[PDB]
């Protein structure tokens, strides 16, 4: 049943058990995201959707916090701005300087949300340098450059839930995590290209384009 | 120089007192000519007065002849196209007072067929600017000797 | 570079973001000005407490009272102190950065006395 709440002072109504981000969308408040797509399951790995809720001490994940009656939510106060800048610092630590050769340039969420919710300049100058990773060969239709992955797990969720191609998975652990088929395989599904529209970064790109 | 020191500052904190003054002045003008002034805006040491095409000559007479507002110089005339509006055009007069060292604006509205009164009766320099606005946007400035 | 902007530690951008702190374009129609007249302002309130004063604002948000009506219903302390000055004189076109002129004559001047041009500081 529809409840009611407060968001940056505006009041909105949506059904129970809903995600806060859907409420914010209803109220027009623009909130960032990488891991959240409407047609896919939820996860909370990107940590960019953080907002302040008076009930809880830390900022919480709009993508996953259930909506409750009478809860008040700010998305403008300094804590949120700092937390977003910090997350984007972290996201762009180990991201290669490939924007000119990335086919997503001009249509990448990482650019836009770093320009809008992020720092003018980075403090990562380390001499040991950025992480690297190898490119996978998952077939003609999808080109890979997996130094650009942010590990959003949109690809996995799509493949295993909407398509039925469970060959795509999350190998490894930690910073050496690697989305891929653990051995050389091909992404056998007739829905394979929708993955390209799902990845925010150009780690999976159309090949004949 | 070892370290350069440039303090961080907003450029708009410089304007707050002038802005309060402009608000008071606009309030005086709205109280003084309630028949004409629909509204007024303020933004960073710039004032704007919103009026209707009938109110152009009267308000200009007030702004040219009144003592506190000797806006004698005509800086510019400009039209702007907002097709989303019923009255798509929005004619804009800018004014200046060398006496008090101040500028002020004055906005009206028009259409492709609804004309605007010409202030060549007062400011002769408006002749060419109104000919421009006609040629550029199509606005018709009634009373103009040679448009 | 300059120091507080090249500082690597306590230099958040959201404090030196002067673009998203831009000052709003205020708009005041006759409705919003008569409320400031019949009522007052946050600095000089003249408003009733509670939902009574709320609907008092609401009466003006709509065409309930007019600008000339509340111009005639305004006591001397209202006008002479919120429309005009306390002295009763109207305000003048404000200057942001005033300039008091001064004349230089004789030897400092760019041209001598005979010429029809002068020199202002």
């Amino acid at each position: 049943a529809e409840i009611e709440l407060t968001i940056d002072g505006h009041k909105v109504s949506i059904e129970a058990g809903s995600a806060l981000i859907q409420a914010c969308e209803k109220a027009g408040v623009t909130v960032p995201r990488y891991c959240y797509h409407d047609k896919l399951a939820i996860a909370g790995n990107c940590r960019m959707c953080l907002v302040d809720v008076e009930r809880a001490p830390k900022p919480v994940a709009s993508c996953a916090y259930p909506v409750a009656p009478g809860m008040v939510v700010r998305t403008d106060t300094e804590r949120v701005k700092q937390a977003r800048e910090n997350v984007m610092e972290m996201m762009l630590q180990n991201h290669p300087l490939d924007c000119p050769v990335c086919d997503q340039g001009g249509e990448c969420d990482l650019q836009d949300q770093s320009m809008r919710y992020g720092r003018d300049r980075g403090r990562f100058t380390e001499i040991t340098g950025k992480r690297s990773t190898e490119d996978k060969n998952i077939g003609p239709l999808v080109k890979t450059s997996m130094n650009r992955c942010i590990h959003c797990t949109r690809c996995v969720r799509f493949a295993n839930d909407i398509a039925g191609a469970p060959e795509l998975g999350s190998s490894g652990r930690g910073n050496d995590m690697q989305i891929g088929t653990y051995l050389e395989k091909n992404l056998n599904t007739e829905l394979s290209g929708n993955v390209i529209d799902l990845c925010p970064v150009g780690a999976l790109t159309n090949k004949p384009y | 120089v070892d370290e350069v020191y440039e303090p961080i500052v907003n450029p708009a904190d410089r304007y707050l007192q002038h802005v309060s003054d402009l608000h008071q002045y606009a309030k005086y003008i709205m109280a003084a000519l309630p028949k004409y002034i629909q509204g007024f805006s303020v933004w960073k040491d710039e004032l704007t007065l919103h009026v209707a095409p009938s109110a152009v000559i009267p308000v200009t007479t007030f702004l040219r002849d009144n003592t506190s507002t000797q806006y004698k110089s005509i800086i510019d005339i400009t039209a702007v196209d907002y097709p989303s509006r019923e009255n798509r055009f929005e004619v804009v007069y800018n004014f200046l007072s060398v006496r008090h060292n101040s500028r002020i604006r004055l906005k009206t509205y028009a259409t492709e067929v609804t004309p605007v009164p010409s202030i060549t009766c007062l400011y002769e320099g408006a002749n060419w600017f109104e000919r421009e606005a006609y040629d550029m946007y199509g606005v018709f400035f009634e009373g103009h000797p040679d448009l | 570079s300059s120091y507080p902007t090249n500082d690597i530690a306590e230099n958040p951008y959201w404090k030196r973001d002067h673009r998203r702190a831009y000052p709003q374009t205020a708009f005041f129609d006759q409705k919003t000005v008569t409320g400031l007249l019949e009522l007052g302002s946050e600095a000089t309130p003249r408003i009733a407490d509670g939902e009574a004063g709320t609907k008092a604002l609401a009466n003006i948000a709509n065409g309930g009272v007019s600008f000339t009506q509340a111009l005639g219903k305004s006591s001397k302390d209202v006008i002479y102190g919120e429309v005009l000055t306390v002295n009763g004189l109207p305000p003048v076109a404000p200057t942001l950065a005033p300039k008091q002129w001064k004349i230089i004559e004789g030897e400092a001047a760019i041209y001598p006395k005979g010429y029809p041009c002068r020199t202002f500081h």
């Binding site: 623009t30 249509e107 809008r116 | - | 831009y22 000052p23 205020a26 509670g50």
Partner: peptide, 29 residues
């Protein structure tokens, strides 16, 4: 102009109205 940004670039500004021109808030009670 088709490369125009899909994200809102500059959020709402900051009020600089003087308090003498702000519509009064009635006291809560």
């Amino acid at each position: 102009s088709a490369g125009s940004t899909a994200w809102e670039p500059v959020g709402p500004g900051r009020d600089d109205r003087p308090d003498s021109f702000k519509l009064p808030t009635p006291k809560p009670e």
